[PDB]
Amino acid sequence: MKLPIYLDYSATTPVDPRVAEKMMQFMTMDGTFGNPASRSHRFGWQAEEAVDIARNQIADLVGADPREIVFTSGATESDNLAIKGAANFYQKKGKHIITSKTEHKAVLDTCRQLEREGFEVTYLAPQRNGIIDLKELEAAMRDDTILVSIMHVNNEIGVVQDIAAIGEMCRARGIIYHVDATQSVGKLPIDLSQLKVDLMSFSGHKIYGPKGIGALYVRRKPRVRIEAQMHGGGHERGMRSGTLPVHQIVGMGEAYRIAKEEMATEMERLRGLRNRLWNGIKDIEEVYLNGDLEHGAPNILNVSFNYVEGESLIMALKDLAVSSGSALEPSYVLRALGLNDELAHSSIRFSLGRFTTEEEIDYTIELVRKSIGRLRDLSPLWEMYKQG
Amino acid sequence: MKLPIYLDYSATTPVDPRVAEKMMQFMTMDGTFGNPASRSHRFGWQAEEAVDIARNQIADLVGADPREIVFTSGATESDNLAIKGAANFYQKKGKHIITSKTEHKAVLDTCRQLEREGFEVTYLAPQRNGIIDLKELEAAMRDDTILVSIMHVNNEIGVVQDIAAIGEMCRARGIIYHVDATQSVGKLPIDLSQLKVDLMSFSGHKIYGPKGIGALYVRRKPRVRIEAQMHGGGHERGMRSGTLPVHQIVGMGEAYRIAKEEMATEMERLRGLRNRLWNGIKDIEEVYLNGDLEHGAPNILNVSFNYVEGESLIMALKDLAVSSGSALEPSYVLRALGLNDELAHSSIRFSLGRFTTEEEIDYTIELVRKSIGRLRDLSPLWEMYKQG
Amino acid sequence: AYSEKVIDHYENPRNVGSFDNNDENVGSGMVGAPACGDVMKLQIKVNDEGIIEDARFKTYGCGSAIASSSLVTEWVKGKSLDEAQAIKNTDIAEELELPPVKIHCSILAEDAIKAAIADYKSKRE
Amino acid sequence: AYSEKVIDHYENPRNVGSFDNNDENVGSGMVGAPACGDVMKLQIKVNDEGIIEDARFKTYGCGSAIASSSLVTEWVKGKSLDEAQAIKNTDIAEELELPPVKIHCSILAEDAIKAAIADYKSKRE
Ligand SMILES: *Cc1c(COP(=O)(O)O)cnc(C)c1O
Ligand SMILES: *Cc1c(COP(=O)(O)O)cnc(C)c1O
Numbered sequence A, B: 001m002k003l004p005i006y007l008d009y010s011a012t013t014p015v016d017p018r019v020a021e022k023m024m025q026f027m028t029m030d031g032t033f034g035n036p037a038s039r040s041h042r043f044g045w046q047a048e049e050a051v052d053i054a055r056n057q058i059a060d061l062v063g064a065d066p067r068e069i070v071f072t073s074g075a076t077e078s079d080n081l082a083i084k085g086a087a088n089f090y091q092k093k094g095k096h097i098i099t100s101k102t103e104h105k106a107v108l109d110t111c112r113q114l115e116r117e118g119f120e121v122t123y124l125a126p127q128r129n130g131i132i133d134l135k136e137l138e139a140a141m142r143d144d145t146i147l148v149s150i151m152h153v154n155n156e157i158g159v160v161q162d163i164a165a166i167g168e169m170c171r172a173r174g175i176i177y178h179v180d181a182t183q184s185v186g187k188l189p190i191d192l193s194q195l196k197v198d199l200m201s202f203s204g205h206k207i208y209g210p211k212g213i214g215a216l217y218v219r220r221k222p223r224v225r226i227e228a229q230m231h232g233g234g235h236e237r238g239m240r241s242g243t244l245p246v247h248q249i250v251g252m253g254e255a256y257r258i259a260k261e262e263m264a265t266e267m268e269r270l271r272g273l274r275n276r277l278w279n280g281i282k283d284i285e286e287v288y289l290n291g292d293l294e295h296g297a298p299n300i301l302n303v304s305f306n307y308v309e310g311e312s313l314i315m316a317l318k319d320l321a322v323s324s325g326s327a328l329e330p331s332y333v334l335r336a337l338g339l340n341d342e343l344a345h346s347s348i349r350f351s352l353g354r355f356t357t358e359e360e361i362d363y364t365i366e367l368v369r370k371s372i373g374r375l376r377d378l379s380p381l382w383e384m385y386k387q388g
Numbered sequence C, D: 001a002y003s004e005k006v007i008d009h010y011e012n013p014r015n016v017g018s019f020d021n022n023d024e025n026v027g028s029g030m031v032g033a034p035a036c037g038d039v040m041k042l043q044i045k046v047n048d049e050g051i052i053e054d055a056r057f058k059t060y061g062c063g064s065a066i067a068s069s070s071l072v073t074e075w076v077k078g079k080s081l082d083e084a085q086a087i088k089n090t091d092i093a094e095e096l097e098l099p100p101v102k103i104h105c106s107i108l109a110e111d112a113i114k115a116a117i118a119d120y121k122s123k124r125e
Helices: A017-026 A042-062 A075-092 A105-115 A134-140 A163-173 A246-281 A310-316 A332-336 A341-345 A358-378 A380-386 B017-026 B042-062 B075-092 B105-115 B134-140 B163-173 B246-281 B310-316 B332-336 B341-345 B358-378 B380-386 C004-011 C063-076 C081-085 C089-096 C100-122 D004-011 D063-076 D081-085 D089-096 D100-122
Strands: A069-072 A096-100 A120-124 A145-149 A176-180 A199-203 A214-218 A287-290 A300-305 A347-351 B069-072 B096-100 B120-124 B145-149 B176-180 B199-203 B214-218 B287-290 B300-305 B347-351 C026-032 C039-046 C052-060 D026-032 D039-046 D052-060
Touching (some): A017 A246, A017 B017, A069 A075, A075 A105, A075 A145, A075 A176, A075 A199, A075 A214, A096 A105, A105 A120, A120 A134, A246 A358, A310 A347, A310 A358, A341 A347, A380 C039, A380 C052, B017 B246, B042 B069, B042 B246, B075 B105, B075 B145, B075 B214, B105 B120, B120 B134, B134 B163, B145 B163, B163 B176, B246 B300, B246 B358, B310 B341, B310 B358, B310 D063, B332 B341, B341 B347, B358 D052, B380 D039, B380 D052, C004 C089, C026 C100, C039 C063, C063 C089, D004 D063, D004 D089, D026 D100, D039 D063, D039 D100, D063 D089, D063 D100, D081 D100, D089 D100
Parallel strands (some): A096 A120, A096 A145, A145 A176, B096 B120, B096 B145, B145 B176, B176 B199
Antiparallel strands (some): A199 A214, A287 A300, B199 B214, B287 B300, C026 C039, C039 C052, D026 D039, D039 D052
């Protein structure tokens, strides 16, 4: 054992040892510490070669051309670059953008800014199960719609949108389609040679890579074009200027090479635990699953418990390191699903990972049963519910 | 010895061992790998505390309030954030910006973009010694000038602009003043409690920290305000959204704590070498110093050799890892100084550092004497010069 | 970010339960204050001719909110009608060392005890 | 990014120097081509009645540009006036394995030899 039990892999994941020891060789004076931009000597070249390896490692995992891989500082920057770059590029065709109310902040806040820049954004409401209704997406599309952004796996509830089907719809009407795939990379399979996705964002620290490094897939064929948001030398094919963080990039490339291998088995193991977990608590009187057990990420499970206050719940689960629908504002995701503020407040996001064990899932199962029945004993609302 | 000799510290510096071993403790599952944003458990807290330590370490080195420290991905992003954020904020007062033609690309390219956004930029030409004439800066200032950006130490020639004097001029006319201090941090002394500087950019990998991490000083008093360019949660006091790269930040904080200590002696040592180097080559018939031996950075030395072609020179110096005035374009810095394309082409930027030795400086001195006299023997221009 | 006393009272709340609302000896007041959407039910039973015999509570909110009403039931035992009447939220906050944010838990706790008292007085009749 | 042969010729250029421009045996042509701003001076002295005795060069440009004119002086030795006349830049580029970018070094090398020849023919008179 070892308390508290880390069940917050969706917030961040621990850098796999293999990822780290590879990074070390690109830092100190005796390692490969050079600047790839230095195109005039050995140091810059050796760094440059390591960069390419990683760029390919990342590309192979998603079935893309390494040239389509643009390096950023993380999924946040990627999301910003993707939606801002394209919107400013294809603005002459139109200024209307479509997206899901449940999108990660990096996307929503970007659209809020764009709105105040003159663009028009349509935030779509998802069904009670989090799934987006494609009929509604279609109705929202107009001749001047230029960009659509729907994420693969959701970071709060782990629901999986049919990005493939959406890609078709978009391509069909000639609309740029962006996918925040940060929670799905290395978990769910991705092949950009099949997928009609124009822009995709990944980070590393969600799949056991280092923080502060990400990538942005920009389709080469049919060519998708974006306006750089980071100027100063026109690096990354003039899409993202700035020195390439080699040791950080190596880290990513390596974590992606590992993902490609162990993703198959690992993801089905997590699915067994997640199921186990829900099994052990689904019988509790008024618990609510947020998302879709069937069609949802295998590593994320978000549930809402009725008649107990959000904060008192978190406190009761001192032994666990999870996340919640609290922040002076409940989770906007859970409220876009059609949960009232109270039910939204009292939600726990269990996120499993590499180090999770059946042993721990069992401990949590009991811990949750214990806490809820106890807090409900203190609850005067529970009583009123219990009797009329 | 050990060839080739690394004289390109201005491109990047090797992560000091102490910096690295501190970073390692914030990566793996047994270290402090948590997300600072996770405000609901031990993991997020321990990471959060380490972040603060580093934020202060950085602040103490420059004499600033840690709250004035905004984290970025590097000096490029800082430069972008600084100039873009303020320009979009204070745009109602005016849309005119002033800057030096010799500024790093991260600044210039930013202003090129802004120009195409509706702003008006005045790129000032420096004197033959690289120093900016303050009388000219003043003449350029108008009632609608809102921002001025002049860098401390120049990255190509290492000239030092009197940022203090400029700060006064700006504050006096109520103009926001930004300083790209990336080449000067941990080398030249900086105290923002004395300096009238409103915005300052630093990175880490120029002073033996990890790449892909930087900071942006935003003055608290008198309050300077900027519009965030990276949206998604309003982190860093709503100026820079995105997960804080702990291990990267720790790296910076640690490299700055080290700088504060060893900067005093180290910088005067480098000055001795740089002098030694120039001593050994200043006697060569037609060599030209770019910058100001007196008033210039102690670690950078950029010289132009006449009557030899740029590329042939670089090739001759196979044994050294330096940088040059080549890229289909000579160095715009050296051409803004008033050097013709040929003299600009054939320039070498020697940048010294932690590991540089007198032994190596001597080797370079002879190597340069050897090469130039040899290439001049092949030069038909040299002959025409030699005889009428 | 919680205080030690709050943890104690949250993890071991004193006087959980409820009284018969027609006990004649009992005055019950259930006050909530949507604004954060909490709600606590406190109620007493009085030693006829003044003094308070016993009280009980149930609550829904932070550990602070809980510890708040817990403390109150504890304080009220052995008190008078009026002695408990002049308790004042401020004192409850000081005791538990409540941060500015969770100050509303005191106000509410006070509301609760005062409301229970008023209920007792109203029934006699 | 340079080829082995280029390195050889750059580091050990063959036939560096210059001839007397009034040698009567010598035809000298100095051609440059601002466009990259290089310049190479090549000149020969001919074995009266056709064949070429010896040549010499000086140049200013890349290692490629240098190796280019170096090679040419080497090739021209023992050649004829016309044999050397039909050298063609392409052949020079193939030999040195020049990348698309440094192709201008061939064109120039050819220019140089052709210009030197023309100079010899012009003086006789
Ligand atoms: C965590 C997360 C992000 C943020 O990306 P960083 O690389 O952490 O800046 C963006 N999108 C999703 C879906 C995430 O889960
Ligand atoms: C290297 C450099 C930069 C770039 O900053 P990174 O942190 O390398 O992105 C900016 N300004 C100056 C003066 C530099 O020397």
